[PDB]
Amino acid sequence: EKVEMYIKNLQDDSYYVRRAAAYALGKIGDERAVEPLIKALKDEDAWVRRAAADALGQIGDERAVEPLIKALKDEDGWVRQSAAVALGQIGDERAVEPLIKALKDEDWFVRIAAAFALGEIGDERAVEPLIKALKDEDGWVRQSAADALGEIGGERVRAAMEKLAETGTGFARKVAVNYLETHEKVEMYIKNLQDDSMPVRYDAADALGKIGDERAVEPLIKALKDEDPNVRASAADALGKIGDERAVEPLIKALKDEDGYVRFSAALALGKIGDERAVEPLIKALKDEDSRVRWSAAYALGQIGDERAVEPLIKALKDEDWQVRKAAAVALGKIGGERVRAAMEKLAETGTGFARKVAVNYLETHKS
Ligand code: NA
């Protein structure tokens, strides 16, 4: 209930309250705040855009990716840097080619952020550009590419480190020689899913989801029954990104978890998967104790597009929570059947307040 003031305060005329919203959404915000924070990225204030990138990466939702890739071409250097670090933290491979370009950014601190990003994604296409980055004019940029080659650490790395220790000059040489003096991936993380330490399990689920390999499905389904709810919810998100339809049934079981964040993550995942069998259980999740879960239920039913949620969403237009209503209105928009039209005209004439207001609007939008 702190979140919704900030979400609304994201479109406020004042540029001082936009900043405090974005700032706070960086600390508190969750998946509900990405579509708004994605819009915040188009602001006039560079502080609002920056803080919005900062938060999108902290939230870590894949929808922020094509937007943050455009924010990499922002006029403000510190907004470019935020966009780079955020793509870093989301771990989506589509950022790699444009993060490589940012590796030659006019500003030193942007190059550092691009190097770090490329390190954290661990895609191998960055190894050569990263190796070329060791000869950058700025020592700190060179140092950041060193650390990013370390993070990736493939055989492509060791290959380039050998060639450099054999042949290179200056810092690049120093780095390669030290590399030698001190010294596939999916399978390591699947094993880490079964680790005793909780952070190792969590990070494993995080990792497998970003990687997106279908190997990880059956082990992540198992992590849905994890001791710890943070791990439980990470494995659900990861299953959502992977998109493998084998998680559908065990995800429907996560819709009845003790933890609200696991339930929330399970529903968002089922909408991404888009399988019809989530419709019934998601409909029953629009009546949840938790206003986040009720939101995710509407959103996912939006993604799925099945007409059996029309009236449960109409009902959801009168939810106590503001943005659950907003989500249900969006969802009826996506579905958009001949059914939805007829429901909306009834609601135009007989509705009250918010539900009436969006029933009127829907009808205005769908005319030509
Ligand atoms: Na900022």
Side-chain angles (χ1 to χ4, degrees), residues 2-368:
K2 297 180 294 183
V3 176
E4 297 147 296
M5 65 176 280
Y6 302 140
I7 293 168
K8 184 180 175 179
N9 268 335
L10 256 200
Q11 259 217 85
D12 195 89
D13 291 344
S14 184
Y15 78 86
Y16 163 70
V17 53
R18 275 143 86 202
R19 295 182 181 172
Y23 192 58
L25 293 177
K27 310 205 219 81
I28 297 182
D30 64 16
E31 282 76 2
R32 296 178 283 165
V34 319
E35 305 262 54
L37 285 170
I38 284 165
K39 290 198 278 292
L41 288 179
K42 297 193 83 65
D43 220 274
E44 305 278 356
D45 200 39
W47 209 108
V48 177
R49 296 209 289 284
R50 208 234 163 199
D54 201 318
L56 284 171
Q58 282 258 330
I59 292 164
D61 194 290
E62 299 208 323
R63 300 172 277 172
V65 174
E66 291 304 330
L68 295 163
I69 284 161
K70 326 198 207 297
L72 275 171
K73 297 169 277 192
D74 193 75
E75 289 178 352
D76 190 303
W78 293 101
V79 174
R80 285 195 302 261
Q81 86 99 20
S82 266
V85 175
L87 289 175
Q89 287 208 279
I90 292 161
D92 191 293
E93 58 151 56
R94 298 174 282 152
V96 168
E97 305 263 58
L99 285 170
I100 279 163
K101 306 183 113 73
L103 214 40
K104 302 145 69 207
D105 192 78
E106 51 173 306
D107 288 325
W108 67 269
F109 50 78
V110 175
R111 298 199 295 273
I112 292 194
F116 169 91
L118 288 180
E120 296 279 301
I121 299 168
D123 193 321
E124 293 203 318
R125 315 206 286 294
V127 176
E128 183 181 9
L130 273 187
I131 283 272
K132 272 223 272 300
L134 297 157
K135 310 262 64 176
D136 187 274
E137 75 207 24
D138 188 293
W140 290 10
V141 180
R142 306 196 291 255
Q143 175 69 47
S144 83
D147 303 328
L149 286 156
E151 298 299 331
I152 301 161
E155 279 310 284
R156 295 195 42 180
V157 172
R158 172 166 310 90
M161 293 297 169
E162 281 172 1
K163 178 165 170 225
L164 274 183
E166 288 157 23
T167 295
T169 323
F171 190 79
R173 186 196 171 177
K174 192 159 229 273
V175 164
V177 162
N178 191 94
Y179 190 90
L180 303 182
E181 302 176 15
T182 67
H183 291 15
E184 184 97 39
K185 208 167 185 185
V186 52
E187 169 272 348
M188 171 202 52
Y189 281 125
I190 300 186
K191 163 194 78 206
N192 286 337
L193 278 174
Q194 301 261 6
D195 194 82
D196 201 40
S197 167
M198 183 279 310
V200 173
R201 282 179 266 122
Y202 179 106
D203 187 339
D206 214 59
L208 297 171
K210 294 164 173 197
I211 290 164
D213 184 337
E214 307 206 333
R215 293 182 183 174
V217 169
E218 282 295 349
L220 286 170
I221 286 175
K222 291 228 293 274
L224 293 174
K225 305 152 280 170
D226 197 73
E227 154 192 305
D228 190 285
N230 305 295
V231 178
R232 269 214 292 286
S234 179
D237 179 22
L239 285 162
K241 298 177 176 183
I242 293 175
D244 194 335
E245 219 154 86
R246 316 201 290 268
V248 174
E249 280 305 325
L251 274 173
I252 291 183
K253 317 295 160 272
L255 283 170
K256 300 158 263 157
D257 205 78
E258 159 221 71
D259 213 79
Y261 190 58
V262 181
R263 285 186 257 127
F264 179 79
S265 311
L268 290 177
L270 286 160
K272 295 176 177 191
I273 291 169
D275 185 303
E276 316 109 47
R277 301 167 280 178
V279 172
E280 296 267 71
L282 288 171
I283 286 175
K284 295 306 163 280
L286 298 164
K287 191 60 158 36
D288 211 271
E289 295 69 354
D290 203 298
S291 33
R292 305 171 288 171
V293 176
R294 296 200 292 285
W295 181 89
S296 58
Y299 193 61
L301 291 156
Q303 295 186 267
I304 295 167
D306 189 294
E307 300 227 347
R308 300 169 275 172
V310 171
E311 264 90 43
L313 292 167
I314 298 295
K315 277 152 203 207
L317 296 163
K318 309 262 69 192
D319 210 87
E320 307 73 40
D321 185 277
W322 168 55
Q323 67 179 333
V324 182
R325 307 196 295 271
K326 159 82 147 171
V330 172
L332 293 159
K334 295 212 200 83
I335 291 169
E338 187 51 42
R339 190 153 312 279
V340 192
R341 167 165 319 289
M344 286 299 208
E345 42 203 61
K346 177 156 189 276
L347 196 61
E349 220 150 40
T350 75
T352 319
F354 188 81
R356 160 174 251 278
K357 279 215 189 236
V358 315
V360 178
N361 178 6
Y362 180 94
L363 291 172
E364 309 195 322
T365 71
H366 285 56
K367 184 54 169 182
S368 181

